[PDB]
Amino acid sequence: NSLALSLTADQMVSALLDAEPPILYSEYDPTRPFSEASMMGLLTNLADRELVHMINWAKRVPGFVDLTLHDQVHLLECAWLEILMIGLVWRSMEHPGKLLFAPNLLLDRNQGKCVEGMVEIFDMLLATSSRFRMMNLQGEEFVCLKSIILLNSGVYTFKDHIHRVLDKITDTLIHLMAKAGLTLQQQHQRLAQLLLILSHIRHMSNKGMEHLYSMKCPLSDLLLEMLDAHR
């Protein structure tokens, strides 16, 4: 019982694709450049709005609905910045050297010098985006990786159902690579490469989180509660 485990590989792909959250816009003020306040203002505002859509996306991730409410809360509180980051990184792929936070908010590493810790977090995000770009990450792979983050990042802090679903998503990934014409060796090599990048995404989240609840001295009440979960 779950429905997710009964899905086929293509059913899994379409379901995840259809669940994809929209790309939101930042505020349309062309005033340049930014202060430390306005820069963090724009990003925080954006992140807070994205979170509302992330939570509806999560409910549509196969297997997530079968979890108890508190298990859903735990996984989201654990992985929210990871999920935002892999989204940002995916968005920025076609823009080498830049971070596409929103279609009207494309930033480079230089525009972050006005904030402590920003250049460092920017460079890592940029490195990740460049990595995805060199691997030619496909959208169908991206949605698999993102759902994996949701289910995996907090699973060790509770589980069998989640691992069964994680197994299903693995099957789906391999199915995608075989469909693309990759040899068997190429398939497991690519799987590994993709999953290992998730370790770095965790790192970026932890490092970013650490700064966030240090300078948390205006965050939305929701963002504060998500942030408070890591403290």
Binding site: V52, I55, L69, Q72, V73, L76, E77, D221, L222, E225
Partner: peptide, 10 residues
């Protein structure tokens, strides 16, 4: 309680 909850319910 938490804002997350409500967002998850509805």
């Amino acid at each position: 309680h938490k804002i997350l909850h409500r967002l998850l319910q509805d």
